[PDB]
């Protein structure tokens, strides 16, 4: 189907949006799968460390896996901070060269909100240049954010 | 009902041919599936790997992890790679066992002489001439599976018979 490439600060709402989006798609009979730290970091990317080079390879491998899911006809949602513009652009081009729909989705809450949420007590990021969608997770709720994504997918005939 | 059907065998043994026919059968019977092969893996995810023993180890490790994701997503994932090393195929199986996902090792078994006689891509001739170095079966090893779930004797069974053998295994193991 396509790749829905989430990006945004820690605590902005990527895990939450991806879970609710997958729920909506599954209940509407649309095949979908999420790539996230829980299924990538200790599997495909277990042999990558902290160096810039390895982080670049981390994103490249995630993008190539999302591309296979998209080619297979799934909505593939990636849920990573994805901080660097160059790496997001590389992920985009991996898809665009194969004519696979790619949606860069900026999960956008202010740092202050993310810090106040501190969902995991964890408490630089390059904001998306021209993403296909911005989800303002401080001003609307999870269901409205999901609906914005679904609308985007309908317009491009994925849903 | 996701799972991985892991093909292994010499160049020209019939992996591409079996995977295509099996995918077509499954699609036509309403069973989601997807094939991982050289065409969608070795110039994408694995574009930064060659054919040295260590790069084959990594090729197969990465493919195993991706196949686990597809099986986890509920697809029948068919992998079509020589996968010549026992240790690496066993690791691929362990990755699936670790995630409670069924894994079926299918040995696509044709004698080397048959594969050389088929010489589908002219590679065996080049290998013998030393024009390609490290070609599996000529100048690098193929370790035959000793406990595969299924052996497809592609020199004595036709493609449709081989596909039906795989479908039967999937039925026995409650996948389809
Ligand atoms: N030296 C070497 N040895 C074996 N096959 C090679 C080699 N050079 C290239 N090819 C071509 O690549 C394919 C094997 O790649 P795999 O990813 O299946 O190999 S492994 O699982 O990593 O061992 C073969 O399929 P083909 O189209 O018949 O040509 C062959
Ligand atoms: N519209 C919205 N979308 C997503 N999450 C929201 C939201 N409004 C409030 N939240 C909350 C739910 C979670 O407690 C928190 C986001 O946590 P998360 O999804 O785990 O973040 P991330 O995966 O981006 O690190 O913010
Ligand atoms: N039972 C069988 N299964 C698969 N291929 C068979 C077969 N009987 C004959 N063939 C032929 C079809 C092809 O020309 C050749 C196998 O080529 P292939 O599928 O490209 O091999 P591989 O992908 O293992 O390198 O053998």
B173, B103 Cβ separation under 8 angstroms: no
Measured distance CA(B24)–CA(A87) in Å, rounded: 36
Q: Identify whether the C-beta of residue B18 lies closer than 8 Å to the C-beta of residue B7.
A: yes
Query: Residue B57: nearest ligand to its CA?
Result: 1
Largest CA distance in chain B: 47
**CATH fold of A1-159, please?**
Rossmann fold (3.40.50)
Contact A20, A142 (CB under 8 A): yes
Q: How far is the CA of B9 from the centre of ligand 2 (A)?
A: 47
Give the tokens for residue B36.
């991982």
- Distance (Å, whole) CA B148 – CA B24: 23
Q: Is B153 annotated as a binding-site member?
A: no
CA A91, A92, A93, A99 torsion: positive or negative? positive
Local structure of residue A119 (DSSP, 8 states): S
Q: Phi/psi of residue B79, each to 5°?
A: -110, 135
Query: Would you state the torsion angle of the CA atoms of residues B131, B134, B139, B143, taken in this order, to the nearest 10 degrees?
Result: -150
Phi/psi for A49 (5° steps) reads -105, -155
> d(Cα B29, Cα B40) in Å, to the nearest integer?
24
Q: Choose among A134, A153, A154, A156: nearest CA to A145.
A: A134
Q: Which of B159, B166, B169, B176 is nearest to B18 (CA)?
A: B159
Distance (Å, rounded) from C-alpha B96 to C-alpha B103?
A: 6
H/E stretch holding A128: none
The dotted CATH code for B1-176 is 3.40.50.300
Query: Which residues share a beta bridge with B106?
Result: B7, B150
Tokens encoding B116: 């050389």
Q: Residues of B19-47 as b/e, b for ≥16 C-beta within 10 angstroms?
A: bbbbbebbeeeebbbbbbbeebbbebbbe
B19 alpha carbon – ligand 3 mean position (Å): 10
Pairing between β-strand A75-79 and β-strand A2-7 as defined by DSSP bridges:
parallel
Q: How far apart are CA B22 and CA B15, in angstroms?
A: 10
**What are A3's two structure tokens?**
């790749």
Annotated domain spans of chain B: 1-176
Residue numbers after which chain A is interrupted (C to N above 2.5 A) read 123
- Within 13 A of A101's CA, how many CA atoms are on the CB side? 20
| CA-closest candidate to residue A94, choices B73, B43, B68 | B43
Experimentally, the structure was elucidated by: X-ray
Q: Which residues of A touch B44 (CB under 8 A)?
A: 64, 67-68, 94
DSSP 8-state class, residue A118: -
Q: Which residues contact B49 (CB under 8 A, 6 or more apart)?
A: B42, B55, B56, B58, B59, B62
Instruction: Please give the Cα distance from B130 to A100 (Å, whole number).
Output: 40
* Contact A95/B at CB under 8 A: no
Distance A124 CA to ligand 2 centre (A): 20
Largest CA distance in chain A: 41
Residues whose CB is less than 8 angstroms from the CB of residue B156 and which lie 6 or more positions away in sequence, other chains included: none
- Alpha helices, DSSP H only, in A14-108? 14-27, 37-40, 52-72, 85-96
Query: From CA B14, how far away is CA A142, in angstroms rounded?
Result: 49
Indicate left, alpha or beta for B104 from its phi (over 0: left) and psi (-120 to 50: alpha).
Answer: beta
Backbone φ/ψ region at B9: left (φ over 0), alpha (ψ -120 to 50), beta = left
Burial zone of B17 (CB within 10 Å; 0-12 exposed, 13-18 middle, 19+ buried): middle
Which is nearest to A101 in space by CA: A124, A78, A76, A119? A76
> Alpha-carbon distance B81 to A143, whole Å?
43
Residue linked to tokens 């296979």: A68
The closest alpha carbon to B9, from B106, B113, B147, belongs to: B106
3-class DSSP string for chain B:
CCEEEEEECCCCCCHHHHHHHHHHHHHHCCCCEEEECHHHHCCCCCCCCCCCHHHHHHHHHHHHHHHHHHHHCCCEEEEECCCCCHHHHHHHHHHHHHCCCCEEEEEEECCHHHHHHHCCCCHHHHHHCCCCCCCECCCECCCCCCCCCEEEECCCCCHHHHHHHHHHHHHHCCCC
Q: Which residues of A touch B88 (CB under 8 A)?
A: none
- Nearest residue of A to residue B34, measured between CA atoms: A72
Total Cβ atoms within 10 A of residue A131: 19
């Amino acid at each position: 189907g396509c790749t829905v490439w989430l990006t945004g600060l820690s605590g902005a709402g990527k895990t939450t949006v991806s879970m609710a989006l997958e729920e909506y798609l599954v209940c509407h009979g649309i095949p979908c799968y999420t790539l996230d730290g829980d299924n990538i970091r200790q599997g495909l990317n277990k042999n990558l460390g902290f160096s810039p080079e390895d982080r670049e390879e981390n994103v490249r491998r995630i993008a190539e896996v999302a591309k296979l899911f998209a080619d297979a006809g799934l909505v593939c949602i990636t849920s990573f901070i994805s901080p660097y513009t160059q790496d997001r652009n590389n992920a985009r081009q991996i898809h665009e060269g194969a004519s696979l729909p790619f949606f860069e989705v900026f999960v956008d809450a202010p740092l202050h909100v993310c810090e106040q949420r501190d969902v995991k007590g964890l408490y630089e990021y390059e904001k998306p240049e021209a993403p296909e969608l911005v989800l303002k997770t401080d001003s609307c709720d999870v269901n409205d954010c999901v609906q914005q994504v679904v609308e985007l997918l309908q317009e491009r005939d994925i849903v």
